[PDB]
């Protein structure tokens, strides 16, 4: 949630997506470490990062 404003985050692995734990292996109830950005050269004027 809205954690400490000044801090460093190096988190990874699914944050308990489902009831069963990830058990160190990806798959169900497990998500990728970080979703992918990638705006196109021309995708909206006020939309680029």
């Amino acid at each position, epitope marked *: 949630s809205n954690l400490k404003p000044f801090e460093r985050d190096i988190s990874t692995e699914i944050y308990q*997506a489902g009831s069963t734990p990830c058990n160190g292996v990806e798959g169900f*109830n497990c998500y990728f470490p970080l979703q992918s950005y990638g705006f196109q050269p021309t995708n909206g004027v006020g939309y680029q990062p």
Partner: nanobody
Amino acid sequence: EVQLVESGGGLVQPGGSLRLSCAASGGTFSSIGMGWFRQAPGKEREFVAAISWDGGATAYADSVKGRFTISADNSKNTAYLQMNSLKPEDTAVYYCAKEDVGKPFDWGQGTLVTVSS
């Protein structure tokens, strides 16, 4: 009874590609653990893939890496499953499930998918 319509099941040649789709009858319009499970002949249920409704997270099993693509639509409230280069062992009955928050597992009728020459 959390109705889930299925489509796309049918016969396919070896190493083919189908167009599968599953749509949910509302289901609270919010799911957390949607995934696809299958039951092969002389075998039991096993994980295949899972995708997130609140985001773009996609989860795939070891044998369905890359070749299979799963995407969910928030506007039409349905899941589209696309695949390529299937193997004979893939013959099994698929199922689409919608996991609601803090509720048991929902299931549908599924479809029969057969691959052979």
